[PDB]
Amino acid sequence: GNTTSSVILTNYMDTQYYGEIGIGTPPQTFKVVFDTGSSNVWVPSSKCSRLYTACVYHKLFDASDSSSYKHNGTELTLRYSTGTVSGFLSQDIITVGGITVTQMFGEVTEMPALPFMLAEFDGVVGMGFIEQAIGRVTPIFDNIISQGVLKEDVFSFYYNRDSENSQSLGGQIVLGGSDPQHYEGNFHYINLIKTGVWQIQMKGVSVGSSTLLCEDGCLALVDTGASYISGSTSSIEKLMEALGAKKRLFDYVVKCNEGPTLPDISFHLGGKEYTLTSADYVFQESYSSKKLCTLAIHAMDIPPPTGPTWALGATFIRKFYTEFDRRNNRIGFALAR
Numbered sequence: 001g002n003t004t005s006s007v008i009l010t011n012y013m014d015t016q017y018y019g020e021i022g023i024g025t026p027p028q029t030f031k032v033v034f035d036t037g038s039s040n041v042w043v044p045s046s047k048c049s050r051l052y053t054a055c056v057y058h059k060l061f062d063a064s065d066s067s068s069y070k071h072n073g074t075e076l077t078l079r080y081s082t083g084t085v086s087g088f089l090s091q092d093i094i095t096v097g098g099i100t101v102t103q104m105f106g107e108v109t110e111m112p113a114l115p116f117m118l119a120e121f122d123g124v125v126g127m128g129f130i131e132q133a134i135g136r137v138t139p140i141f142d143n144i145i146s147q148g149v150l151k152e153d154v155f156s157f158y159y160n161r162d163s164e165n166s167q168s169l170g171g172q173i174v175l176g177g178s179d180p181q182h183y184e185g186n187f188h189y190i191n192l193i194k195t196g197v198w199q200i201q202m203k204g205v206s207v208g209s210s211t212l213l214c215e216d217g218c219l220a221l222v223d224t225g226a227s228y229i230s231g232s233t234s235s236i237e238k239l240m241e242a243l244g245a246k247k248r249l250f251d252y253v254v255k256c257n258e259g260p261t262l263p264d265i266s267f268h269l270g271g272k273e274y275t276l277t278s279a280d281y282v283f284q285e286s287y288s289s290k291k292l293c294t295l296a297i298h299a300m301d302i303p304p305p306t307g308p309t310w311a312l313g314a315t316f317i318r319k320f321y322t323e324f325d326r327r328n329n330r331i332g333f334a335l336a337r
């Protein structure tokens with residue numbers, strides 16, 4: 001077995017990254033987020049009523065136009081930090097890359113306007129473990145591993161920084177390996193705490209020189225479906241004070257002129273310092289002192305058993321190419337380029 005597939009990703013404003021999959025024969029394509037913090041695959045269903053304006057605005061899967069579709073109809077409900085989708089299970093072949101696998105996924109027939117009217121993508125391909133899958137549906141990567149087609153039992157993420165270029169690649173996911181065009185040096189591997197969750201230990205978070213946060217250790221989820229870095233309300237309040245940031249309704253901001261001279265924030269992982277500077281974490285839409293600029297960091301209280309935990313989302317992954325290694329239960333980071 002020696003295949004390594006690769007899916008190009010569109011980068012929308014540094015907050016949503018999504019690629020295409022095809023479902024059925026002939027394929028119906030969908031825009032989907034590849035999410036290490038969840039484990040189910042779903043797309044909107046042709047059976048989704050118009051009453052759901054999010055189903056009006058996205059691509060719908062029509063079972064009856066595919067010959068490889070296999071009925072199941074068991075009910076499915078998925079709860080995310082953003083809201084809940086609901087529908088039922090269907091089997092069909094899914095193409096990502098590269099690779100064709102037979103999969104159980106959700107056809108979604110309830111999709112709330114909040115917040116899917118803001119989703120540039122249609123559905124989600126969860127990349128987490130079966131342990132976290134609702135209905136214990138076998139996850140796509142498990143089904144792929146079963147095929148024995150992959151060079152190595154790993155996948156990795158490159159997320160680029162938004163750009164004005166017509167060209168210039170938003171991001172890329174590799175299945176089976178990592179792409180040395182988008183990282184320098186070698187991977188520093190850190191071991192999962194346990195199989196079941198893409199989560200490692202974190203020994204501290206510092207702002208400036210001082211170990212401000214997580215001073216006695218804490219957890220970090222490595223969450224490719226998260227836009228920002230997240231911590232618990234209690235940590236984030238502390239961090240945001242340190243930066244002089246202001247809490248608004250949807251974000252934290254600073255005066256744009258102040259952004260560039262804000263302290264670095266470092267994350268202490270597997271014995272090393274992973275530093276994002278204020279250029280990595282302020283959306284500097286101008287440098288005016290009369291404007292407010294958003295930070296790519298916010299509070300999310302992730303409930304037990306998976307939290308309390310930080311999550312290292314795109315703000316972090318932009319700087320560090322990330323490889324998810326299911327064979328050895330570990331995560332590798334190297335500098336992205």
Ligand SMILES: CNC[C@H](C[C@H]1CCCOC1)NC(=O)N1CCC[C@@H]([C@@H](OCCNC(=O)OC)c2cccc(Cl)c2)C1
Pocket residue numbers: 015016017018033035036037038080081082115116118119124223224225226227228313314
């Ligand atoms: C379990 N993993 C973390 C979850 C996963 C999301 C998958 C899709 C449905 O929601 C959950 N993400 C979050 O909790 N986020 C915080 C709130 C907004 C999300 C944000 O997701 C863009 C896709 N994520 C991305 O490109 O990461 C690089 C979003 C923004 C606007 C509308 C929607 Cl519907 C979702 C990010």
Ligand SMILES: *[C@@H]1O[C@H](CO)[C@@H](O[C@@H]2O[C@H](CO)[C@@H](O)[C@H](O)[C@H]2NC(C)=O)[C@H](O)[C@H]1NC(C)=O
Pocket residue numbers: 071072073074089
């Ligand atoms: C739809 O999916 C459900 C979920 O697995 C299937 O129900 C299982 O069927 C197997 C085989 O008959 C049983 O051993 C299990 O007891 C069932 N699981 C549950 C949770 O009930 C069902 O068979 C599928 N239907 C079709 C036709 O695909």
Ligand SMILES: [Cl-]
Pocket residue numbers: 038078079080134
């Ligand atoms: Cl869930």
Ligand SMILES: [Cl-]
Pocket residue numbers: none
């Ligand atoms: Cl609201």
Ligand SMILES: [Cl-]
Pocket residue numbers: 212213214215234235238
């Ligand atoms: Cl803390």
Ligand SMILES: [Cl-]
Pocket residue numbers: 014279280281282283296315
């Ligand atoms: Cl940024």
